[PDB]
Tab-separated table of C-alpha atoms and ligand atoms in Angstrom:
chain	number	residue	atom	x	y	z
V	211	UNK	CA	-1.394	20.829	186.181
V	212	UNK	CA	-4.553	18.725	186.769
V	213	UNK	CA	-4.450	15.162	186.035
V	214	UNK	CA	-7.930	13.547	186.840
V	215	UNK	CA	-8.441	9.962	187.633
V	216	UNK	CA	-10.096	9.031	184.563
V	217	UNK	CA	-7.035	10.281	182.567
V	218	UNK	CA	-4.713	8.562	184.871
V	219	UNK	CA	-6.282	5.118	183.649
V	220	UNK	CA	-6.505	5.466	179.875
V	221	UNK	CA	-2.612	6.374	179.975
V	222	UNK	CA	-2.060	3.267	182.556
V	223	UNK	CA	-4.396	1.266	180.234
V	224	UNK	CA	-2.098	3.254	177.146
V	225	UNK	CA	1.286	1.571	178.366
V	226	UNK	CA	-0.400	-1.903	179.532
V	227	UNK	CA	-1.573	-2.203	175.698
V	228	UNK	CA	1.617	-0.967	174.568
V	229	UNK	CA	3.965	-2.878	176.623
V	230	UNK	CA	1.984	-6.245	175.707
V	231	UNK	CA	2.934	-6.108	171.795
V	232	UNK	CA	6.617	-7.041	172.703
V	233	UNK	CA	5.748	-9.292	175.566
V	234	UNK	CA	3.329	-11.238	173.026
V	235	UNK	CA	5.792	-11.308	170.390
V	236	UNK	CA	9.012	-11.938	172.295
V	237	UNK	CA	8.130	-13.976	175.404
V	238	UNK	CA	4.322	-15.780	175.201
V	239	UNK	CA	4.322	-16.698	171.854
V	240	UNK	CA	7.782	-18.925	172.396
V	241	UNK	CA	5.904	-21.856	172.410
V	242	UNK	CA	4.065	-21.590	169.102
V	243	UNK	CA	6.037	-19.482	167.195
V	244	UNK	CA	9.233	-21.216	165.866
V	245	UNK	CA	12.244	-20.899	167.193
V	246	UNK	CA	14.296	-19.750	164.475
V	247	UNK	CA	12.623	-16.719	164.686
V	248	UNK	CA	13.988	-15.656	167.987
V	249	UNK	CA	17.962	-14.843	168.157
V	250	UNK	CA	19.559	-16.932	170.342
V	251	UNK	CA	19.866	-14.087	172.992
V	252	UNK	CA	15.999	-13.982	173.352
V	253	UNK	CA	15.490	-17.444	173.592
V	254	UNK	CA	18.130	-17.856	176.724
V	255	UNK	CA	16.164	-15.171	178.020
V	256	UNK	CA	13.148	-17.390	177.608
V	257	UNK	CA	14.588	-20.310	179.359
V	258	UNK	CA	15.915	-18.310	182.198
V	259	UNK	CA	11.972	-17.282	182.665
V	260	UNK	CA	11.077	-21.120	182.553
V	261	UNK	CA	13.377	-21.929	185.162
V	262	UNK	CA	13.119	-19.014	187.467
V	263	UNK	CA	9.547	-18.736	187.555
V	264	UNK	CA	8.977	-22.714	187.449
V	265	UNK	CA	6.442	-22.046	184.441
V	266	UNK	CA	4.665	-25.104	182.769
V	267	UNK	CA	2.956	-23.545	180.782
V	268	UNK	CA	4.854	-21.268	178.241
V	269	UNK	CA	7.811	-23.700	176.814
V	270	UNK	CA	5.658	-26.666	176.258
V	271	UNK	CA	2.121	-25.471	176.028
V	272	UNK	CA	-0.586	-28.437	176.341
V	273	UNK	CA	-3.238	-28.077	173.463
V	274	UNK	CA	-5.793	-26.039	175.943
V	275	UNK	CA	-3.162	-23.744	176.252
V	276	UNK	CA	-1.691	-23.591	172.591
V	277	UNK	CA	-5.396	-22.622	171.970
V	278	UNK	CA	-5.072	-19.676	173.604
V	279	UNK	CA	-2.069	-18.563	172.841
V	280	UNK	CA	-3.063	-18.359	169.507
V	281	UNK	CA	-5.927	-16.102	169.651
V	282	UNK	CA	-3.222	-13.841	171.624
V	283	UNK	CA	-1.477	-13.978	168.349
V	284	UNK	CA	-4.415	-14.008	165.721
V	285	UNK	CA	-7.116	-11.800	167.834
V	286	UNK	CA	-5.490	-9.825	170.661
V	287	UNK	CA	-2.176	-8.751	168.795
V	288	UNK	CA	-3.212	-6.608	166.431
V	289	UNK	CA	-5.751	-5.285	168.588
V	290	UNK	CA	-3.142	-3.919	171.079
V	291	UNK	CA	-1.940	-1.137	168.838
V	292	UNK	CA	-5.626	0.286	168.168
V	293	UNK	CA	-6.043	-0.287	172.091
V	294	UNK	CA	-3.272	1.768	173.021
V	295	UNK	CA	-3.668	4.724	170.102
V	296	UNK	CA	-7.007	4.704	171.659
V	297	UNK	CA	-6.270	5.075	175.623
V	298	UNK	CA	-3.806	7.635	174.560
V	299	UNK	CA	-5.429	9.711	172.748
V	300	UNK	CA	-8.170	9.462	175.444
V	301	UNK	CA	-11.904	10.671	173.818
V	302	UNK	CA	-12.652	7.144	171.439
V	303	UNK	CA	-16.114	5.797	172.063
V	304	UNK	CA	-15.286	3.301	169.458
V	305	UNK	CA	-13.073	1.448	171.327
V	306	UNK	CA	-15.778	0.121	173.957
V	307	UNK	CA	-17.429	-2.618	172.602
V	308	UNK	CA	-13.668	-3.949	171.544
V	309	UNK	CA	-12.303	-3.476	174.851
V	310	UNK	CA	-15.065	-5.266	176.593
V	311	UNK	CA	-14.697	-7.842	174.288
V	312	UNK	CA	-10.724	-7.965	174.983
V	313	UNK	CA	-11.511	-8.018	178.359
V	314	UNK	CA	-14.108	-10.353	178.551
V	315	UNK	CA	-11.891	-12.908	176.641
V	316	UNK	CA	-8.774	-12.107	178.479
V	317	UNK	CA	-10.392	-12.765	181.826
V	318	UNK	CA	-11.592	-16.324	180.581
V	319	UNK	CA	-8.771	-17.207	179.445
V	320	UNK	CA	-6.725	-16.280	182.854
V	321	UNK	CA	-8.840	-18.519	185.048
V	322	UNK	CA	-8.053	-21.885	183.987
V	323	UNK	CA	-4.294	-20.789	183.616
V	324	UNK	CA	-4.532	-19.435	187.675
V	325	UNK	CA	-6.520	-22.782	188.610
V	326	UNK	CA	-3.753	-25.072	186.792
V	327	UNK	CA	-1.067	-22.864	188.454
V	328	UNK	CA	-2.315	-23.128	191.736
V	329	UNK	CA	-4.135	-26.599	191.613
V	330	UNK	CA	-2.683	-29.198	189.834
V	331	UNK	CA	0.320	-31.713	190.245
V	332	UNK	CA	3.800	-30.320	188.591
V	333	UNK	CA	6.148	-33.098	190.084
V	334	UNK	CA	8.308	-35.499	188.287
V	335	UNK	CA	5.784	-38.420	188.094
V	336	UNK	CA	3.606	-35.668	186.393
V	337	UNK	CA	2.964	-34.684	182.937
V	338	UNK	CA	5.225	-31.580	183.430
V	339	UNK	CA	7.767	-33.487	184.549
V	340	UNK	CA	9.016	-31.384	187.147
V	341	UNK	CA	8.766	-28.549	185.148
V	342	UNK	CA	6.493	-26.459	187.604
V	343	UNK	CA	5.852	-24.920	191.126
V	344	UNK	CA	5.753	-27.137	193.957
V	345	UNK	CA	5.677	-25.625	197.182
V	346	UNK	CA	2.658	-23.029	197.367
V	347	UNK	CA	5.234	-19.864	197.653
V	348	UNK	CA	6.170	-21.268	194.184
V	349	UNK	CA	3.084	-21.487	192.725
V	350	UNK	CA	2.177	-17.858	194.093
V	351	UNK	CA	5.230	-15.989	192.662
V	352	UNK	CA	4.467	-17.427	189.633
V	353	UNK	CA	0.642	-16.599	189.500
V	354	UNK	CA	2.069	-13.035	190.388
V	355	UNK	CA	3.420	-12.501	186.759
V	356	UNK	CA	-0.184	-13.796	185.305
V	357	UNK	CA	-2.300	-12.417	187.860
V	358	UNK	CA	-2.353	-8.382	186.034
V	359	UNK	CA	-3.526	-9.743	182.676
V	360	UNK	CA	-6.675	-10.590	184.786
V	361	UNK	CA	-7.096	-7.514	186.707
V	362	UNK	CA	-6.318	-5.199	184.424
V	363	UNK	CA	-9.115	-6.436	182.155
V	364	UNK	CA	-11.347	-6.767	185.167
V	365	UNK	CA	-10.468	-2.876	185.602
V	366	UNK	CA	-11.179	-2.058	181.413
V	367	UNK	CA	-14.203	-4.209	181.470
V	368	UNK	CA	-15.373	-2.150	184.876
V	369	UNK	CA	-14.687	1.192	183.120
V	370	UNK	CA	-16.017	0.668	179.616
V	371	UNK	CA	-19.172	-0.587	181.148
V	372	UNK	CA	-20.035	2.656	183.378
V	373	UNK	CA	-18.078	5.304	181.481
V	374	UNK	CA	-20.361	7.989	180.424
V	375	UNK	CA	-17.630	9.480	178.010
V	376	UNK	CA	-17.237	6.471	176.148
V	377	UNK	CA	-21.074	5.497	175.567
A	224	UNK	CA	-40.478	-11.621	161.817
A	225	UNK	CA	-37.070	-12.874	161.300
A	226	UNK	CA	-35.721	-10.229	164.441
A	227	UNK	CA	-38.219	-11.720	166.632
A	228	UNK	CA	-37.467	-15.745	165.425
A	229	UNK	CA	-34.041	-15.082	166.745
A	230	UNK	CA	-35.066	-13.910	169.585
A	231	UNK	CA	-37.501	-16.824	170.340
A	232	UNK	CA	-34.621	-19.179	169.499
A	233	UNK	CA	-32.648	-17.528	171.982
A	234	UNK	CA	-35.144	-17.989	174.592
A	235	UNK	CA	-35.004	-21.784	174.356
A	236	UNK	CA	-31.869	-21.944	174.050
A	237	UNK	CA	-31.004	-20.310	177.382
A	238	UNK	CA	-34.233	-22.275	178.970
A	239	UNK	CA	-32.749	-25.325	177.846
A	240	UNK	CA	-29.648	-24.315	178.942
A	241	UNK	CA	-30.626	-24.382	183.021
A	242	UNK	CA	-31.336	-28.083	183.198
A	243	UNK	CA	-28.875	-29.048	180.520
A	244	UNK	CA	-26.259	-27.197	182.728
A	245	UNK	CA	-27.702	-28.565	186.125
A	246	UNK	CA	-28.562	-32.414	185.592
A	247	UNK	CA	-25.559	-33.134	182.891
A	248	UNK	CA	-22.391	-30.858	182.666
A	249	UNK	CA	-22.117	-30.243	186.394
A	250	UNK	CA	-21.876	-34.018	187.057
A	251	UNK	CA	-17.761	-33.600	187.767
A	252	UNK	CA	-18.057	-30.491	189.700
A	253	UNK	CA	-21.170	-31.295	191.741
A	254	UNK	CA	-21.255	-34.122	194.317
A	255	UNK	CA	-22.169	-37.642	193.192
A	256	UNK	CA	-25.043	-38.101	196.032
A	257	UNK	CA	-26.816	-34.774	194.898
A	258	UNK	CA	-28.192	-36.872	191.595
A	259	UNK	CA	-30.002	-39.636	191.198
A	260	UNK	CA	-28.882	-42.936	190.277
A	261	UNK	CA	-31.502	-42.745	187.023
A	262	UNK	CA	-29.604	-39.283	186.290
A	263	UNK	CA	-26.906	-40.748	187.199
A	264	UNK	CA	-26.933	-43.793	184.616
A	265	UNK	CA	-27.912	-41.023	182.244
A	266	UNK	CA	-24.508	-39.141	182.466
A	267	UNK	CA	-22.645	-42.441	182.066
A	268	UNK	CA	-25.243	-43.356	178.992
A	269	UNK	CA	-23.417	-39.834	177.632
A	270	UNK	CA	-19.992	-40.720	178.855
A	271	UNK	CA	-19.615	-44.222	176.715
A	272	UNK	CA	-21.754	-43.413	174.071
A	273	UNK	CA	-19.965	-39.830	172.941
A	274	UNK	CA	-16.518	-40.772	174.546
A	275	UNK	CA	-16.155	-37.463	176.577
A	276	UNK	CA	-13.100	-37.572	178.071
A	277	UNK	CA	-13.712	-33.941	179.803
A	278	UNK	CA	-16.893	-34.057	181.627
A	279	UNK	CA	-16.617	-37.022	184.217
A	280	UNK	CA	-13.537	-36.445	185.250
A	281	UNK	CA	-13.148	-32.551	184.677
A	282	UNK	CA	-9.335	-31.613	184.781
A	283	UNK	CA	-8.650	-28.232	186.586
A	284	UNK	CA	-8.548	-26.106	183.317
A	285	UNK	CA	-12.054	-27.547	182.298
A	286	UNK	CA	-12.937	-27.297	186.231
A	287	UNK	CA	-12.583	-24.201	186.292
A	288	UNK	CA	-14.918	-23.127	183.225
A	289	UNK	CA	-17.786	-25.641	184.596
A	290	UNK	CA	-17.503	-23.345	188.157
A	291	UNK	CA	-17.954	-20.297	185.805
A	292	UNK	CA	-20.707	-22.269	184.322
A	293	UNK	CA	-22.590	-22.440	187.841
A	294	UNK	CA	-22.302	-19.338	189.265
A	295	UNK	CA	-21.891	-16.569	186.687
A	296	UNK	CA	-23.555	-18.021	183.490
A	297	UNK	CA	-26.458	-20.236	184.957
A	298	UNK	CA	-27.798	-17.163	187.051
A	299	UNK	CA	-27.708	-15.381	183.310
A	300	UNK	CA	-29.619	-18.173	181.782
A	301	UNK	CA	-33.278	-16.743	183.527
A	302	UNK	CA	-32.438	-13.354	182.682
A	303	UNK	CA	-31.760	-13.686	179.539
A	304	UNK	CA	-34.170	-16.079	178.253
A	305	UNK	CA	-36.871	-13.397	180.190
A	306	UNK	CA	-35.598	-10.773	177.971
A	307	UNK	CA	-35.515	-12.603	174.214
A	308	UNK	CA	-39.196	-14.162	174.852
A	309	UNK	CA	-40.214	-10.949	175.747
A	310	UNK	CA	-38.461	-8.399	173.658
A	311	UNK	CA	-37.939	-5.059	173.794
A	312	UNK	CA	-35.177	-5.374	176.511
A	313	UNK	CA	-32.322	-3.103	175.063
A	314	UNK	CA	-30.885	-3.345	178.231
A	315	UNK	CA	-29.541	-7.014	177.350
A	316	UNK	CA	-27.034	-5.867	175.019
A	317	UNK	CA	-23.902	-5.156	176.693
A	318	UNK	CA	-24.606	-8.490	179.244
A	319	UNK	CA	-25.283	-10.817	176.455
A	320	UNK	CA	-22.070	-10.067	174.656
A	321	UNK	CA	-20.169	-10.743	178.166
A	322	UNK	CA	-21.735	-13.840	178.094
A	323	UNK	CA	-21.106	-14.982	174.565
A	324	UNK	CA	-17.582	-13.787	174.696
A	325	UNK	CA	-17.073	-15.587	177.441
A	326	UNK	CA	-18.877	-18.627	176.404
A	327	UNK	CA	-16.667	-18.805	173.093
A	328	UNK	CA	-13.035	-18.412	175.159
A	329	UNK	CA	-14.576	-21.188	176.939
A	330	UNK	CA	-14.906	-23.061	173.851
A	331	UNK	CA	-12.153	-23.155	172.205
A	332	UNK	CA	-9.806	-24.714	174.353
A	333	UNK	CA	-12.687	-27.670	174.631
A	334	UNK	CA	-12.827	-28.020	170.884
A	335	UNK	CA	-9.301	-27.919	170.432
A	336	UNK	CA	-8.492	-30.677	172.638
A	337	UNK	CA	-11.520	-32.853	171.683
A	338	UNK	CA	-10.125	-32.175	167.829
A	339	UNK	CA	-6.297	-32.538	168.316
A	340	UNK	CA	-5.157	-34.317	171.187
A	341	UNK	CA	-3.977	-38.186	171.085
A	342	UNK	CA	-7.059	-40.048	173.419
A	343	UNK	CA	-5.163	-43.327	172.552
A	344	UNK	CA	-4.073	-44.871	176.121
A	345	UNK	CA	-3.088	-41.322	177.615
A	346	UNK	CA	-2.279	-41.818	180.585
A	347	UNK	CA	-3.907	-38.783	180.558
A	348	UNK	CA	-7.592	-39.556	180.471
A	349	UNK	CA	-7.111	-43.242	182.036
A	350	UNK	CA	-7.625	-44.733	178.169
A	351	UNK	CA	-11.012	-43.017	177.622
A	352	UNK	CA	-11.974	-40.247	174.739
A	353	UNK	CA	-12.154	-40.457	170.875
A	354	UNK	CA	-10.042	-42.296	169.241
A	355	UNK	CA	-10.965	-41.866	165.265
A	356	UNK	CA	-12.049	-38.415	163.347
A	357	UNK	CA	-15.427	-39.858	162.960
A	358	UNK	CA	-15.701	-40.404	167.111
A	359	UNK	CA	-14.456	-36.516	167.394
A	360	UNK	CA	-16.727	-35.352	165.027
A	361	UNK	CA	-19.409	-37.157	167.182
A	362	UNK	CA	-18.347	-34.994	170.573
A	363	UNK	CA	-17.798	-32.104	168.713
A	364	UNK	CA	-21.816	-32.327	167.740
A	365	UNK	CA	-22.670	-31.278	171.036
A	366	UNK	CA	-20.275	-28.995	172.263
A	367	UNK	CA	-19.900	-26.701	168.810
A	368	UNK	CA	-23.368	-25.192	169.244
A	369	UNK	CA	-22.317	-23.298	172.400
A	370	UNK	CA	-19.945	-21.982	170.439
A	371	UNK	CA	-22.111	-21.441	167.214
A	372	UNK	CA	-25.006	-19.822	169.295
A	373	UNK	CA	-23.060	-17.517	171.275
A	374	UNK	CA	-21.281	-16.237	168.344
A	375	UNK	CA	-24.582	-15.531	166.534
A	376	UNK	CA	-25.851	-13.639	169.718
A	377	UNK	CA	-22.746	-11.598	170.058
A	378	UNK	CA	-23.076	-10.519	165.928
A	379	UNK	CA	-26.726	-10.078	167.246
A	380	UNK	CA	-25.935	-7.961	169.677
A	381	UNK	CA	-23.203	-6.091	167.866
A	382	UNK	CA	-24.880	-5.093	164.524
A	383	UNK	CA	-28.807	-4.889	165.022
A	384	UNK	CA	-29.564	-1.821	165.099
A	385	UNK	CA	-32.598	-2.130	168.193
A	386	UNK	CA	-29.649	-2.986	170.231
A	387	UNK	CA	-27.331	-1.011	169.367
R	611	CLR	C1	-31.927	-32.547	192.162
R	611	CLR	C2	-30.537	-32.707	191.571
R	611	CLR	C3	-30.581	-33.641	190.374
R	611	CLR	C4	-29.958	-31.357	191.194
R	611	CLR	C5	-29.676	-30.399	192.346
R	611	CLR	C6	-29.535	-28.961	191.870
R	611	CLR	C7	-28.837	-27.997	192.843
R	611	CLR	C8	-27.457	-28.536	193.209
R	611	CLR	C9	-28.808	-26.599	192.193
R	611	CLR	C10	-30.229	-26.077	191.891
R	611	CLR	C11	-30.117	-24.539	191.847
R	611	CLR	C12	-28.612	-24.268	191.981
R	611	CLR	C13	-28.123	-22.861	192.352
R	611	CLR	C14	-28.581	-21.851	191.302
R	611	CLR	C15	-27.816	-20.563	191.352
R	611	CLR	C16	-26.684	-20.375	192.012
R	611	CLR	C17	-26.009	-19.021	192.008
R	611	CLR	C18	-24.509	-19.108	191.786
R	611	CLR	O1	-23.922	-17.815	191.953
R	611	CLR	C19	-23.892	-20.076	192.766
R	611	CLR	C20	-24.511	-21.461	192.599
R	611	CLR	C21	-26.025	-21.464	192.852
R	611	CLR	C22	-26.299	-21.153	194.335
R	611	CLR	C23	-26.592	-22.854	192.442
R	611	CLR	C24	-26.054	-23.997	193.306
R	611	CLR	C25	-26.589	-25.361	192.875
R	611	CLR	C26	-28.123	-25.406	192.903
R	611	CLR	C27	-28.640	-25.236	194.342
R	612	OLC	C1	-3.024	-11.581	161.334
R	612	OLC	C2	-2.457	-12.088	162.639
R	612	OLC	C3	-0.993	-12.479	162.537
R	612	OLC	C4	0.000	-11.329	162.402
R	612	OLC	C5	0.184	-10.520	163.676
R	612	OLC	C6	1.486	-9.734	163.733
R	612	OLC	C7	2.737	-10.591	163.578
R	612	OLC	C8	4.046	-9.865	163.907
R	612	OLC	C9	5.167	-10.219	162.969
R	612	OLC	C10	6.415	-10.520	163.292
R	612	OLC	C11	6.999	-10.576	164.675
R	612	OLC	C12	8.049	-11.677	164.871
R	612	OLC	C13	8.758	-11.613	166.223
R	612	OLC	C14	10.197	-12.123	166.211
R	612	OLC	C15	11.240	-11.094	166.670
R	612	OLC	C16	12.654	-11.664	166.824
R	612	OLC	C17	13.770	-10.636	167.031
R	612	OLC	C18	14.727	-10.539	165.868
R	612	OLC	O1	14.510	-10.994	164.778
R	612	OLC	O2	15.837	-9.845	166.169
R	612	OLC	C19	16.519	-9.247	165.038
R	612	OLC	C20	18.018	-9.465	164.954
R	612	OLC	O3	18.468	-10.526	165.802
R	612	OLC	C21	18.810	-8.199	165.208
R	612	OLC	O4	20.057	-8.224	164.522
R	613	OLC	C1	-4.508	13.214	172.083
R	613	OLC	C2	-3.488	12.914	173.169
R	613	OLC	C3	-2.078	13.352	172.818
R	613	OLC	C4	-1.057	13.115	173.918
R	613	OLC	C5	-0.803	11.647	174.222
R	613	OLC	C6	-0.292	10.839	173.028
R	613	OLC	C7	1.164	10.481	173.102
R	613	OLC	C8	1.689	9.297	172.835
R	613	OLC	C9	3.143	8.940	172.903
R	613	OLC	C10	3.462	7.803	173.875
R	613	OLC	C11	3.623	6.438	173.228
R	613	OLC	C12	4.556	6.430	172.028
R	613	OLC	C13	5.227	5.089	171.785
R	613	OLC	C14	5.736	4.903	170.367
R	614	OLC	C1	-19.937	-36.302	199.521
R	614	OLC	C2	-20.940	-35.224	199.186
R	614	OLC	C3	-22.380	-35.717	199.192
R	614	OLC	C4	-23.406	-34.604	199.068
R	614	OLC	C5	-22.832	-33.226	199.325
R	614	OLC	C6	-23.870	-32.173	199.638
R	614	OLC	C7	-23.336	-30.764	199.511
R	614	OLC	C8	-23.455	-30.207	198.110
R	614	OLC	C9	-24.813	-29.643	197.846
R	614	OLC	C10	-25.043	-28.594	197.094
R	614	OLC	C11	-23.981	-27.813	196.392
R	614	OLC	C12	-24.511	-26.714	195.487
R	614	OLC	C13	-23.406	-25.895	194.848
R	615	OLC	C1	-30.072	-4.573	187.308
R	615	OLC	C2	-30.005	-5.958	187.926
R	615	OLC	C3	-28.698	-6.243	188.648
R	615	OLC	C4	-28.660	-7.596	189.339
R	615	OLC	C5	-28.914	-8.761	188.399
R	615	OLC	C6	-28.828	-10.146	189.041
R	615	OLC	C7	-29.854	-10.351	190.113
R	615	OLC	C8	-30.303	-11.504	190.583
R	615	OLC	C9	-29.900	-12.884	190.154
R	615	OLC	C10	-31.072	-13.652	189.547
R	615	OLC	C11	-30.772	-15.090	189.144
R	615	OLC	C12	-30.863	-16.092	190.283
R	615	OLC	C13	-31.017	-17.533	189.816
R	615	OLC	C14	-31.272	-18.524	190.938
R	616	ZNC	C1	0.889	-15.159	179.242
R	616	ZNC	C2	0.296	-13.967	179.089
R	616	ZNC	C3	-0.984	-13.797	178.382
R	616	ZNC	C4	-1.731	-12.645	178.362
R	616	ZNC	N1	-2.867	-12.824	177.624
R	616	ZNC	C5	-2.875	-14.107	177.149
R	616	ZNC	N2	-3.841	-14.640	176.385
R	616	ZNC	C6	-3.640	-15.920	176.031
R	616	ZNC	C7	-2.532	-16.670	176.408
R	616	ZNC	C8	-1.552	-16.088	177.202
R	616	ZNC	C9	-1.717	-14.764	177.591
R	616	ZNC	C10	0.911	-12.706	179.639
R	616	ZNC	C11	2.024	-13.019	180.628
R	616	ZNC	N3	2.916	-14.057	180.110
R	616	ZNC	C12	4.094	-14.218	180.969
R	616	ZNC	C13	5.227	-13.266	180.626
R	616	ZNC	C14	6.475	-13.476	181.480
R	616	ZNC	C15	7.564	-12.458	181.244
R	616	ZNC	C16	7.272	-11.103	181.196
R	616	ZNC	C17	8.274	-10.170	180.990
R	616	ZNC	C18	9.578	-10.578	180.829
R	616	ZNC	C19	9.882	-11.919	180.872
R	616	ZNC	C20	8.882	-12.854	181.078
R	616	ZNC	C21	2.187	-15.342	179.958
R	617	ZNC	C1	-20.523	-28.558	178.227
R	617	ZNC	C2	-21.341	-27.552	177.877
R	617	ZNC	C3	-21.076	-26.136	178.193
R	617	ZNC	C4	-21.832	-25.084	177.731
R	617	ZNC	N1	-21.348	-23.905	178.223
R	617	ZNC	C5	-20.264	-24.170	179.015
R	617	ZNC	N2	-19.541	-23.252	179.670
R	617	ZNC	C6	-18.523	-23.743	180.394
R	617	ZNC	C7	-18.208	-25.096	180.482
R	617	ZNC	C8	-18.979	-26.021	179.791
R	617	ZNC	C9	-20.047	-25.559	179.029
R	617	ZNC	C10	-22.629	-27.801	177.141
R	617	ZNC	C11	-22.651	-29.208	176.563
R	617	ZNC	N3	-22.260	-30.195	177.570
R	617	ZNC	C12	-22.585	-31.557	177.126
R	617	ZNC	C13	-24.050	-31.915	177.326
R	617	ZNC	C14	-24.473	-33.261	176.734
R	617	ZNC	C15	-25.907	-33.630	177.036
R	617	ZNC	C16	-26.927	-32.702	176.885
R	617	ZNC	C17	-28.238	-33.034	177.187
R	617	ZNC	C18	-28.546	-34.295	177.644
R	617	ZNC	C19	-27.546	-35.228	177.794
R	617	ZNC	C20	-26.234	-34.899	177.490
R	617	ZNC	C21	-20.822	-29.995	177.940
């Protein structure tokens, strides 16, 4: 019938929320979490990300990394099923001081992972050892699986901010 | 009036926060000609006495917050401090808790590493940083209150009911 644009948004923001509770749980969080509580299946499926994507980040994460990851697991977790119930159901002015706050976090937490990923030295004689994008078409496919979890809070933070219906 | 001692708080701390953030933390991202050599010797009086490991030398992770630091927070600072000393500015709100947000993402990656990470000839950081709790605790003094005071605004923000 009529779907306005508005609409369109909270049930993209609906799925983004939704679809980040696995991707938390069964791909991010490989590198805190222990192993043992991944079948074997799922963590083959990890390493074949690792290697594909040429991420140094994930498997091994250094300690300004492992800090974030765990406020993904601690803050943003279990605020991704309220998120989503909320964007569904489409009319809660309660969620806008927590989404800006999600997205406000999020963004800050993306930078420094897109400057390392597109800056810094991933060769052998590196830290990484190896374990990381070298030519600059490597680095830039692998910014493009990071790259939404900045936008997409740049777009939430844009629309809870000027949305009459949610102020 | 406890509202308005808060407030007054806040407006030093974000006027201190301009040349603290100009003359000192901007020393890696900023070119070494720009300052003085008496601001100069000042930063490396900081350096060896507090053991910072981050702030000469920034890596690109703690590069990249110091950039945020110049462009989006430092034009803030004015703003903000404007609106605490003179009250009444409801329109602060939903900026301010950007900003402390922000500010305490920033934070945490800073204070984990200064806490947690092995300083001890690290190839690293070239065999500089702290090397017992008591030397941690030491850095740690001055970079937990930018994490302390932007959590207070944010609960500021948040719950008080002029605000909203
Ligand atoms: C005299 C020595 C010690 C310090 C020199 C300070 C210089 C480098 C400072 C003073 C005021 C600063 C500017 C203040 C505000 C902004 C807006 C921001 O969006 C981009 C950076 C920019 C444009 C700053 C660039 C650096 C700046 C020009
Ligand atoms: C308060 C903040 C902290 C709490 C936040 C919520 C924590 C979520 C809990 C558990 C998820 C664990 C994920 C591991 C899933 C592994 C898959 C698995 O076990 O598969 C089953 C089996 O192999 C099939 O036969
Ligand atoms: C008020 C709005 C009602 C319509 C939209 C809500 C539907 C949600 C199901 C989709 C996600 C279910 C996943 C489990
Ligand atoms: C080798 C460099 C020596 C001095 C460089 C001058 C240019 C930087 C001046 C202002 C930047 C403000 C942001
Ligand atoms: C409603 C206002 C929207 C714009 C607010 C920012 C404007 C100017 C930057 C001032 C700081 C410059 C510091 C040098
Ligand atoms: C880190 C992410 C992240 C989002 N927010 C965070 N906050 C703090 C710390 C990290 C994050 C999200 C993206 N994720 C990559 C997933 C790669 C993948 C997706 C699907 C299937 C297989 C593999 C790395
Ligand atoms: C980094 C800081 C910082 C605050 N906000 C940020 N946002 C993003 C990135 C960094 C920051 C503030 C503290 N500062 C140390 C000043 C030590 C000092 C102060 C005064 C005189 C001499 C020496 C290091």
């Amino acid at each position: 019938g009529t779907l306005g644009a508005r609409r369109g948004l909270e049930w993209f923001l609906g799925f983004y929320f939704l679809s980040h509770i696995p991707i938390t749980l069964l791909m991010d969080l490989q590198g805190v979490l222990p192993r043992d509580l991944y079948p074997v299946e799922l963590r083959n499926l990890q390493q074949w990300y690792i290697e594909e994507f040429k991420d140094p980040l994930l498997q091994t994460p250094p300690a300004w990394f492992k800090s974030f990851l765990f406020c993904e697991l601690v803050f943003q977790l279990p605020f991704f099923p309220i998120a989503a119930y909320a964007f569904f159901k489409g009319g809660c002015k309660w969620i806008r001081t927590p989404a800006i706050i999600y997205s406000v976090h999020t963004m800050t937490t993306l930078i420094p992972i897109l400057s390392t990923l597109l800056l810094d030295d991933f060769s052998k004689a590196s830290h990484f050892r190896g374990q990381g994008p070298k030519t600059f078409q490597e680095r830039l496919f692998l910014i493009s699986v990071y790259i939404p979890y900045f936008l997409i809070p740049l777009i939430l933070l844009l629309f809870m901010v000027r949305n009459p219906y949610y102020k």
